[PDB]
Amino acid sequence: KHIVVCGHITLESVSNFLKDFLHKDRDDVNVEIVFLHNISPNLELEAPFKRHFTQVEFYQGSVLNPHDLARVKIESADACLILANKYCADPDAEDASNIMRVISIKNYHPKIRIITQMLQYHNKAHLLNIPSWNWKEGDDAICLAELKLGFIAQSCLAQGLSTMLANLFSMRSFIKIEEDTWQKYYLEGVSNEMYTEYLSSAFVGLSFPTVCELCFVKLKLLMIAIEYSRILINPGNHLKIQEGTLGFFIASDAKEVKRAFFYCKDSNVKKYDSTGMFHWCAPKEIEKVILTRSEAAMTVLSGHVVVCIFGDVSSALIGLRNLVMPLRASNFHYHELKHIVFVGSIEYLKREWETLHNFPKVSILPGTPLSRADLRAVNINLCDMCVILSANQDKECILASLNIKSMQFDSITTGVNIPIITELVNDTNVQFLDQDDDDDPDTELYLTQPFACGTAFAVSVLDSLMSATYFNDNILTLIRTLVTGGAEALIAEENALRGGYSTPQTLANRDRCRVAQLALLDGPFADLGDGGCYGDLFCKALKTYNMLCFGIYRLRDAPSQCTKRYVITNPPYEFELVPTDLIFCLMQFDSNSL
Ligand SMILES: [Ca+2]
């Protein structure tokens, strides 16, 4: 068996790909990895790969040449993977070049499975016009803008979620440490992966919550979703398991997951898009949402999302709707929607506005993330999250967080505990975000403190999704569903959310779970918070509320003034809680909430 890898083939991308792929591949003895690359080969370590990896072949050529497709044997290849140049100055041109690759490959052999990266959502949509593009039969498009900004969006609801999800398809060996440090418990959580498996016929007729509890208690498996088709994430009491239901699980090894299969014994007004999946308003002219610094200072905002954008009129477009849209999912109540305030170049942001103008509660302060006056005007110290992004052309981004941290407010307080997530292009630059951690350029991103705490994200963590998708493309579908707020045909044609009137059928689409974070200082889980065990909390949340818990966000220093928290995914039943812990969970929509 063999796969063909093409597109952006460099020493960096080849090595990174092989690292992911060969960690996950259980039958690597019998799988040939064939790289096809355009320019002549400088033995850019072409030779070393030939030593280290004896099942890795290189071919000079293009997937646009039918003879080169015959030379690498596309007709009998298990899949063709297309790596994008993620940092291209012109994402539309890069996407078009990869769509052309798909067209050429599919012309040569229609039934070849293709997995491709796409930079922008609007280009992903063009693949549907290729007749032989068959997503049902395994053709996959990994959209980088959609996923990266989705991961970030959900992290505005529960900080650390981006890290947790990333680590569920990180294909690295579990690493152990003996001492009782924060790293120990983080690393126990890192060993988890997402799997799918059919549910035992013995579960048929039982409710998801019942089966989920049985999996947790009896099998030590965390089941998060099912598919009869679309994926239901933590469905409630009324949803019963049918024959041939596929379960989605989080576990330490694939062997454990097998137990789940073998188990024995308002009416006149348009307020939503036409599907009822997202909040929607009539298109506003950008002048209606632009604030001056004085105007912004008059309205005190709190619980809001401040989005700091580095970029000028000439920058490549980010696709900011990929951030905003999940934060406008219809399974949020209008009143709980987080106000989004963009701080950056108005001539940049004017170019994004066409695909943002139907989302409510969006403001723009023309200015710069480095201006303390702008940040004070938008109440940076009271926000639920500050997101720091750069448009395509790290030091600007890093400087902005350092600047925020050192600001003083109001007893005067610093900005050191302000919630921030910074997008980095270069993994190495994670070293400069925190001043109280161990730095090393050779240490991978996932082990660093900013990543472990969910204060840094890089599109590079999505690279491993390519290998993950090859081995199990249900994992991509789950991740996309979770981070985008749920889902496409109408958007593929129009490239815009059309408004629509509410019916019973469109309003029923509101009833799906949302990401949230549970505190343990008071309320019904406080007794368990005080030295109780995670498993009792999990069962109580699930039985009483159909609330599914999937980890802890724990204080690094659980005497200390540091409020930094790190992710602990899928902890065991007996794991001991502390009162300051926050719990990652999926909560049911509550229609009567007020
Ligand atoms: Ca550092």
Curated annotation (Swiss-Prot):
Signal peptide residue numbers: none
Residue ranges, annotated region (Segment S7): 149-169
UniProt binding sites for Ca(2+): 431, 434, 437, 439
Segments on the Cytoplasmic face: 1-590
Motif (Calcium bowl): 422-444
Region span, Segment S9: 300-320
Record's comment on post-translational modification: Phosphorylated. Phosphorylation by kinases such as PKA and/or PKG. In smooth muscles, phosphorylation affects its activity.
Annotated spans, Segment S10: 451-471
Binding site for Mg(2+): 32, 55, 57
Domain RCK N-terminal: 1-142, 302-410
Annotated localization: Cell membrane
Tissues of expression: Widely expressed. Except in myocytes, it is almost ubiquitously expressed.
Family: Belongs to the potassium channel family. Calcium-activated (TC 1.A.1.3) subfamily. KCa1.1/KCNMA1 sub-subfamily.
Entry text on domains: The S0 segment is essential for the modulation by the accessory beta subunits KCNMB1, KCNMB2, KCNMB3 and KCNMB4.
Record disease entry: Paroxysmal non-kinesigenic dyskinesia 3 with or without generalized epilepsy: An autosomal dominant neurologic disorder characterized by absence seizures, generalized tonic-clonic seizures, paroxysmal nonkinesigenic dyskinesia and involuntary dystonic or choreiform movements. Onset is usually in childhood. Patients may have seizures only, dyskinesia only, or both.
Function noted in UniProt: Potassium channel activated by both membrane depolarization or increase in cytosolic Ca(2+) that mediates export of K(+). It is also activated by the concentration of cytosolic Mg(2+). Its activation dampens the excitatory events that elevate the cytosolic Ca(2+) concentration and/or depolarize the cell membrane. It therefore contributes to repolarization of the membrane potential.
Other remarks in the entry: The protein was initially thought to contain two functionally distinct parts: The core channel (from the N-terminus to the S9 segment) that mediates the channel activity, and the cytoplasmic tail (from the S9 segment to the C-terminus) that mediates the calcium sensing. The situation is however more complex, since the core channel also contains binding sites for Ca(2+) and Mg(2+).
Oligomer status and interactors: Homotetramer; which constitutes the calcium-activated potassium channel. Interacts with RAB11B. Interacts with beta subunits KCNMB1, KCNMB2, KCNMB3 and KCNMB4. Interacts with gamma subunits LRRC26, LRRC38, LRRC52 and LRRC55. Beta and gamma subunits are accessory, and modulate its activity.
The protein's name in its UniProt record: Calcium-activated potassium channel subunit alpha-1
Species of provenance: Homo sapiens
Residues of the full protein shown: 408 to 1179 of 1236
